[PDB]
Design a protein around this ligand. Sequence first.
Ligand SMILES: OC[C@H]1O[C@H](O[C@@H]2[C@H](O)[C@@H](OC[C@H]3O[C@@H](O)[C@@H](O)[C@@H](O)[C@@H]3O)O[C@H](CO[C@H]3O[C@H](CO)[C@@H](O)[C@H](O)[C@@H]3O[C@H]3O[C@H](CO)[C@@H](O)[C@H](O)[C@@H]3O)[C@H]2O)[C@@H](O)[C@@H](O)[C@@H]1O
Ligand SMILES: [Ca+2]
Ligand SMILES: [Ca+2]
Ligand SMILES: [Mn+2]
Ligand SMILES: [Mn+2]
Lengths: 240, 240
Amino acid sequence: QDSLSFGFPTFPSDQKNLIFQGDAQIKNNAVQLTKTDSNGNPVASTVGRILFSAQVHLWEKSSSRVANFQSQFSFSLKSPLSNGADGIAFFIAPPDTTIPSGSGGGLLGLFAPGTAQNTSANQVIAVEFDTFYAQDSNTWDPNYPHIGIDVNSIRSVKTVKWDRRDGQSLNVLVTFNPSTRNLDVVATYSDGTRYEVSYEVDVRSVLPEWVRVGFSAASGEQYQTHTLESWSFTSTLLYT
Amino acid sequence: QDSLSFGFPTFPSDQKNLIFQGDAQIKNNAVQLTKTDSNGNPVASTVGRILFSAQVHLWEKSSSRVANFQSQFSFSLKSPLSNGADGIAFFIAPPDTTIPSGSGGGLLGLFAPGTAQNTSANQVIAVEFDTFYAQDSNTWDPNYPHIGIDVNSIRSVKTVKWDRRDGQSLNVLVTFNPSTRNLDVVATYSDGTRYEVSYEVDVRSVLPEWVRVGFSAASGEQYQTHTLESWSFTSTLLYT
Ligand SMILES: OC[C@H]1O[C@H](O[C@@H]2[C@H](O)[C@@H](OC[C@H]3O[C@@H](O)[C@@H](O)[C@@H](O)[C@@H]3O)O[C@H](CO[C@H]3O[C@H](CO)[C@@H](O)[C@H](O)[C@@H]3O[C@H]3O[C@H](CO)[C@@H](O)[C@H](O)[C@@H]3O)[C@H]2O)[C@@H](O)[C@@H](O)[C@@H]1O
Ligand SMILES: [Ca+2]
Ligand SMILES: [Ca+2]
Ligand SMILES: [Mn+2]
Ligand SMILES: [Mn+2]
């Protein structure tokens, strides 16, 4: 289909169109990407991702069209620790994507250690909300919590300072305009605090024509819950 | 998802989200539900169907919600003969639905011979565009071409006389309003010739909460091409 759209105002336990990977699972009308104990408390060493089952037609070679898409979502992070890790990410990847071996912790369940920073060995675009930046383990991160745009590498092509607020929902709008090739990210807290970051990227030289969209999260030695509360997505092919 | 929407202005050959069953296949940016020979002509004894891969949440018991949906599509029938058979149908059925044994010809690939008229044995709602009605084989049909609403039986609960026009596209709009429970069908040829048939049906009593939507067509001894040219669909769960 040239256009596809779907919305999850909440996440009831009875799902049919979501592909669960790793420890991801639904609890209390929300997606808990990372594992939690019986008390609903976050645990270490966990990775989880979800993907919408239907494939998205991102671009079409034969007709010179590229999709205009928008992803609006809401999530909250919670941890009794002062340094909850590692973060959650909205990503776009080939349809057959699976959790890479050893992609836990700072790799956010998106990259394999061996090629995490090799832009030539990956095919993924992701917007990360990264809360762990210890300069000794996450050597690629700026020294502070941040929102980053990742293009085939865990080392963001760009970041902006971000404030982690325990138990508060962050509303995010990610959009791509094929005309300007601008990928824009706008995130806000309920008090109006706003964050914005934009990047120009030709998705055609990074991803195949058909892809799957979803979320990924992980916790290494430090942990926190990564709760996806809502998500709506829309995509339509346009001439360029 | 509470809401799902997709649109196929045309049908390029590289499909990812369509389930092809029987003889259905893509040709010339359109879906040929029934088999055709090399030079593109219709052949006898052929059944074919397609379903969108993502499951549609038709109703949710926990919230007492039912989806309002709208399916828009156009198709054309072509046949060297003037007695083209057997027809095309838009249908909604459980997710695991498959072509029943011996459902060719007048059964349109939707019902099994032994239970075609047993309502309590089927789970399907379909809008049929029936062009063959010989009373010896299709004993359940009115004596003329027609559009019918089928609820668990090949014997339509409601029909309207219809005119088959070889090689001309029929634009169809099917809508279900959960508030009134009316399933409305509006079909028109480009010259404005309009056909309307409606029926009140409580979908919760006929189909499971999650379903799949698609098209089915077949030809027995008599034949014609069943070309699905475009298809748009949208459903949203609502409180009544
Ligand atoms: O150095 C100060 C920082 O300490 C804390 O962070 C540590 C640190 O960055 C580094 O320390 C390595 C070792 O240090 C020793 O002193 C002991 O503390 C050892 O236990 C410790 O292993 O790395 C630590 C481990 O990093 C993992 O966890 C982080 C946070 O979740 C991830 O971002 C990393 O990617 C990494 O995860 C990987 O390894 C895990 C197993 O070790 C595995 O489970 C994952 O799947 C993944 O492969 C780190 O905790 C902390 O207090 C900082 O705030 C402080 O600045
Ligand atoms: Ca990090
Ligand atoms: Ca018939
Ligand atoms: Mn980062
Ligand atoms: Mn009939």
